[PDB]
Amino acid sequence: PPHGELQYLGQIQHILRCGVRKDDRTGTGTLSVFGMQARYSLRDEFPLLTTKRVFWKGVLEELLWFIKGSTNAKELSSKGVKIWDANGSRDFLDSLGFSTREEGDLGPVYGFQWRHFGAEYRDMESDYSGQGVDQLQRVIDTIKTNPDDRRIIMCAWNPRDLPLMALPPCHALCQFYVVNSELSCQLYQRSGDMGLGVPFNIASYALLTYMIAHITGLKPGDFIHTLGDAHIYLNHIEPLKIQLQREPRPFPKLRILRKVEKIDDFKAEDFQIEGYNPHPTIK
Amino acid sequence: PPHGELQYLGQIQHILRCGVRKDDRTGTGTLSVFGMQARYSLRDEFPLLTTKRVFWKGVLEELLWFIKGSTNAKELSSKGVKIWDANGSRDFLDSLGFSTREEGDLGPVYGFQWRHFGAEYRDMESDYSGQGVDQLQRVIDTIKTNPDDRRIIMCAWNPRDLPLMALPPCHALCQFYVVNSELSCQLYQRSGDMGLGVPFNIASYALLTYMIAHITGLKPGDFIHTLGDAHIYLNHIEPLKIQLQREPRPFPKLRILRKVEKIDDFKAEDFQIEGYNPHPTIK
């Protein structure tokens, strides 16, 4: 019965052995392979990497933040997760050109894209209800009425809204799949920081799958992860070499205590990870 | 060198040997698998299904037709290809509830999105010039300026252009990757028919590569075909079993004759296949 984390650790083995140098927007060089796909099981397990601590409080905290549609990093920075705030700051904010944007305004990110697609973006405080298109719900719905639908997709990438967001989504699209009352998900990430980012995503979208299988009375299945430019920065090569050695521990279990009906009602206090024992630190 | 067709024939032995039963729309049954991804090398050879002849014409024609930005199926039938010709009648349009829809009108399909993403659609005829986001052009554009950027995505999926669209996007999106003057492309298929569909789609997106490469003085790298719902129609059971017997023949060579500068000036007679040796179909 092979372990899930070997899938992730394995992809790293590959990137290191065959990855070619490639710089980014900041020109920083990285080793990189293009086009990958891992399949983590969600069956009474939770793919929260064990060869290194994963920011669970962030994973959760941010996920709900999206569900809320909130597109103001200042509405998450106060939730105890400062992994966006630097995108709303006057400096970088105005730096992008939107010098006329309010401090904390990230723009049309996932949140607004998951509930108000195509919706003319006004502001991070502007009312958008009935405004646009909400796929997060439409996804939920379809699952319920016709789970055979092989077009239960939820795109967050918007060519129109692209040159207006704090930064393009690394999450192109995710299409849900249902068979034998099990809820499978496939996420398509365009870019992927196998070092300090990818693991945080495996969680984030394993979580959502768990939340929806909940609401829909479905049962968690397989979470397929597909990447375009899979890379790792050079700083990380050394650390990852060691972590590459650590043996993967048993994936924890995710349990929701309060039975919820409206996905929009879910609350941070509604989940509790039990059994998360990652390895100390590496650096 | 490990044959590449072993991939397709490799994904098929799985679909059968492990696929569950999953019926669909007009509801025939089919064994399914969710999450797959083959990698096809585009180095000095075109990935053309050898175990079974492929309608290279329709493939070649369809593409140029997509570049055109045509939503008129008849326009594609005119070149002697009747694949998208299903909807080319007032029978299908009304079947969805379309009256104003003058026969042949496929709606805001792919070409309309490629060239006019988010554009306001009226019908086949209208002058959509400058209306929307032309992912296609903007793609070849970015491949020349800075091919190091990881945002070369061609999204043909749009939630607001779905209810009006004819046949939903069986290619949610695709992403281009360049490195060391090499051009690679991975296509995301929300649903693929491993029987008589995938072969075509494969060749159909490999070509677009060869074209983009040629226009940007780049060399065809890899073609990552990432599938979502990969299924084998029950009908196609018996045949595909034996097709799994006839060892795969050398992948074709698509030699370009002349130098188009941009995809748009490409002509049907611009592609000469060399060495295509496909098996003799039975049924």
UniProtKB/Swiss-Prot annotation, chains A, B:
Catalytic activity reported: dUMP + (6R)-5,10-methylene-5,6,7,8-tetrahydrofolate = 7,8-dihydrofolate + dTMP
Q: Per the record's keyword annotation, is Transferase included, yes or no?
A: yes
Residues the entry annotates as binding dUMP: 25, 150-151, 170-171, 190-193, 201, 231-233
- Gene Ontology cellular-component annotations: cytoplasm; cytosol; mitochondrial inner membrane; mitochondrial matrix; mitochondrion; nucleus
In its UniProt record, a GO molecular function of this protein is:
sequence-specific mRNA binding
Write the record's keywords in alphabetical order, separated by commas: Cytoplasm, Disease variant, Dyskeratosis congenita, Isopeptide bond, Membrane, Methyltransferase, Mitochondrion, Mitochondrion inner membrane, Nucleotide biosynthesis, Nucleus, Phosphoprotein, Transferase, Ubl conjugation
User: What EC number(s) are associated with this protein in UniProt?
Assistant: 2.1.1.45
Q: Which residues carry this modification: Phosphoserine?
A: 89
Q: What is its main location?
A: nucleus
Q: Which residues bind (6R)-5,10-methylene-5,6,7,8-tetrahydrofolate?
A: 193
> Which of the seven top EC classes does this enzyme belong to?
transferase
Active site feature: 170
Question: Renumbered to this chain, where is the cross-link Glycyl lysine isopeptide (Lys-Gly) (interchain with G-Cter in SUMO2)?
Answer: 262, 267, 283
Parts of the chain that traverse the membrane: none
What's this chain's function?
Answer: Catalyzes the reductive methylation of 2'-deoxyuridine 5'-monophosphate (dUMP) to thymidine 5'-monophosphate (dTMP), using the cosubstrate, 5,10- methylenetetrahydrofolate (CH2H4folate) as a 1-carbon donor and reductant and contributes to the de novo mitochondrial thymidylate biosynthesis pathway.
Which disease?
A: Dyskeratosis congenita, digenic: A form of dyskeratosis congenita, a rare multisystem disorder caused by defective telomere maintenance. It is characterized by progressive bone marrow failure, and the clinical triad of reticulated skin hyperpigmentation, nail dystrophy, and mucosal leukoplakia. Common but variable features include premature graying, aplastic anemia, low platelets, osteoporosis, pulmonary fibrosis, and liver fibrosis among others. Early mortality is often associated with bone marrow failure, infections, fatal pulmonary complications, or malignancy.
How does this chain assemble?
Answer: Homodimer.
Q: What is this protein called?
A: Thymidylate synthase
